[PDB]
A and B are shown apart, each in its own frame.
Chain A
Amino acid sequence: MRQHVFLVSEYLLMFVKLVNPCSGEGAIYLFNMCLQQLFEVKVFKEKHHSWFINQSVQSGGLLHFATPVDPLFLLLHYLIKADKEGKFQPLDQVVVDNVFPNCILLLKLPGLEKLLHHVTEEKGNPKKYYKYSKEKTLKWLEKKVNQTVAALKTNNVNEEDYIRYAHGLISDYIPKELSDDLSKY
């Protein structure tokens, strides 16, 4: 029986394997059911470490962190995928994954319409059909970079110097193809 050391948000549901928006591979997430909230699981791994939990030893030395995610990043992964395919589709046909079947959870998120407004061009009479917009996305990413730059100064991490750092941090949530357009933007 392996013990896991977790650092979750104060107020705190199951563990779900969803797609990594930048890598396109597997990633563990912690979904909250009652409040329809999404969290990402990050792991601290460094060589030569172990845990002593009361009267037991844990060989790892691993520290897990469950921090909130902006759901738009994962939503973009499916919107970008559908974008090349054709034009204007309903959300149930865009957020489709045979590899990661737990993407259904994204469709039931509270306030999807208001969120999607940031990255998509939509049509429908009060439906709803969505098409990935590049102009809106880069404008939304421009805000994301400014949001992080404000947070970097406060936390005192390490104007142009911190901007190129914030772009690299945000590029760990958007695929390589999008990252290049963001720098040129």
Chain B
Amino acid sequence: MDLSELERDNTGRCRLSSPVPAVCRKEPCVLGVDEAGRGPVLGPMVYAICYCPLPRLADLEALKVADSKTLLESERERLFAKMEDTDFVGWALDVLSPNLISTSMLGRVKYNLNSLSHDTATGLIQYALDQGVNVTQVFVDTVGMPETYQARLQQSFPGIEVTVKAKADALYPVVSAASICAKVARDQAVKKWQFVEKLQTDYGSGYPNDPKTKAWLKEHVEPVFGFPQFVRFSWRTAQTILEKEAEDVIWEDSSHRYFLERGLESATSL
């Protein structure tokens, strides 16, 4: 019933799902997609999907599972549990570690944040399909352009009704519920974050403009390593601090044939 799986070490991806209801396999389902942790320099990014059958859509409105910016962490946890005791509500989470965000964006081939965000979304929609969920309608909340995202998802799912809209959380109840899952999972992920580094608290929201975050960032600068894995190296906030406070690093991106082929030469010094 609780997100206990978030207690173990994360260096890549961490998938969490509710058991698929019996109803969800037969009746046609409606799916909602939302995210938490897109903007912070610190911590993971969580993507969530929430599904329920078409007849029990009004029954989803019956419980006050609507999204709100005012909602407390405890207030969201009560609505999440209220979904868990519901015989028809299903859900699936994807907790992308700051290291996975860093490594993807800072790779040899640039895997952009928006592609990685959209690919995680399709992956959960596909996961549901593979799990016997009869998804016939998909509702997605977007931060930017809905036209391209909707066209993308239609090519990925040509037999499913795809609706991508800005502020879809305030408009559709499935998207509101998915939003509660993402926020709860994000809060719980940053709360009990198992940390890979052998050194050890208050950082704030994790956002770049946050004074506590930039204070924590400046404090945790190491000249050789730069920052611990909890920081998103790809973010311009981390990069600028690194450029001024840490030591320079050079990557490939930024005499007879035998000896020349294997970078060998005679030593003139030491």
Contact = CB atoms under 8 A, between A and B. Distances in A.
Interface string A43-59: 11111100000000100
A40 interface: yes
B223 to A, nearest CB: 10
B266 interface: yes
B250 A40 contact: no
Contacts, number: 52
Interface in B229-270: 250-252, 255-259, 262-270
A130 to B, nearest CB: 27
Given A44-B263, A45-B263, A27 B268 contact: yes
B215 interface: no
A168 B257 contact: yes
A20 B259 CA distance: 15
A26 interface: yes
Interface in A101-152: none
A171 interface: yes
B16 interface: no
Q: Chain B interface residue count: which class?
A: 10 to 19
A93 to B, nearest CB: 28
Nearest to A170: B256
Interface in A12-59: 15, 20, 23, 25-28, 40-48, 57
Nearest to A43: B267
A48 to B, nearest CB: 5
Contacts of A40: 266
Nearest to B269: A28
